[PDB]
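Hi W.,

Here's what went into the run:
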Amino acid sequence: EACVEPQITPSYYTTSDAVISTETVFIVEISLTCKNRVQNMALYADVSGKQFPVTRGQDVGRYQVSWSLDHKSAHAGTYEVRFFDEESYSLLRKAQRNNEDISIIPPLFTVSVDHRGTWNGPWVSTEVLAAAIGLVIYYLAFSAKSHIQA
Amino acid sequence: PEASPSADTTILFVKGEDFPANNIVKFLVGFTNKGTEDFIVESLDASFRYPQDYQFYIQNFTALPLNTVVPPQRQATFEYSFIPAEPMGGRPFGLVINLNYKDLNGNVFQDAVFNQTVTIIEREDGLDGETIFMYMFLAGLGLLVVVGLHQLL
Amino acid sequence: KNEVADYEATTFSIFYNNTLFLVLVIVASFFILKNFNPTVNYILSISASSGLIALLSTGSK
Amino acid sequence: EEGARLLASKSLLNRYAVEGRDLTLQYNIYNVGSSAALDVELSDDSFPPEDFGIVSGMLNVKWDRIAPASNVSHTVVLRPLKAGYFNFTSATVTYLAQEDGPVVIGFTSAPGQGGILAQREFDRRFSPHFLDWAAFGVMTLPSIGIPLLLWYSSKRKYDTPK
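Here's what came out:
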């Protein structure tokens, strides 16, 4: 039974430490509430065209979908996760298979995952930065010292 | 040790059947206990063997000792991962995957889940310096040649 | 004349010496003793930086 | 038998396991059976709340249907609150092999025994000490900057050009 006026309270997680994590994992969890009290409603999640079946937790109304990606592709920016019910999800496969526009089908709701980028180690190590600034300071003093002693 | 008729196994290669050299390969073994008695999964093994002589081991990969129990009419999945040497690419190898399991009574059964010759593939993922450096020379050789021709004539 | 020479020699000697100690410590601690146990790195960096400056002070004449 | 066949893998997406940081657990389900599985349930009780802290993700979930020759994924984030060896045991998955058929119980892969490191080893190895360096430069400003000006101010008074 199609959810009427679905109210959602989305929460998302994203990998921010590449040194420990082999990949960048995104997790979108939705505790969906329906006006018709429709429990156990099948849901699907579409990410940039890739279809992921939304997971249903044991607690009523909680939903989760998690899709992983490689570090070299998990570029910083914004991610928009779209969802479609079983009725609409059937149309989406037809549109994709028939190469019709995927935007023509409106999604039940959208969740945006704001990825700020993962840490790939310092661009220039602070120690190297520390050494140069001090080394530059030494040379200037060395430039000063020689001037006096010359 | 022959494969007991009460046990059914499967192997699924996560990233397809391509075995790229110097890259992690992952596959998942499945075990089904159709018998009436318990089955204990001892350890899973993999090795490389000569295509023309399966009796000659080339590389033996560390065994994964599972020592896990699969009761009757229950399924179990086991992950095994290994990294093939970089130079092996572009040459075939006889890849063997064996599952070792025993019944409570002390009988040992072995199942060669995957017994086929597999090819390690060549890769060009990026234009690293070696690609550029051979780009500088060929252009540079012509640049000296083209410039050299102008001066001489 | 002595007061200016006395003072300015004190400051520039003071200023030059402090820079060399810190700069030497940083490089030695994080580039030469990068693989040493912090006390062992601490012992060597501080000693080498201070000890070398002690020897370099006489090595500047 | 052309019933459903689900191969499950419970694997860790962390190169190391370090206390207090985020630990990744990925459950991957592959439907190598010819018929689509129905009412797939996965339960992971192997993690007590005392040791691992759930940051995001539900250990226990259910899926309505899985098509044949297809796969599904599921990830959960945990934080090891302590340091010490842990045996990452197997999970349990129940699904129906055939429409109105017997429930098939299956076990997911087991990572095995994995060691968890101590935090103080990591911060000294991969945590950037931005703020420490900035304070260090200010900490060394009084030792260097003031004497240089004190010298320079004297130079400003006697360095009269000829």
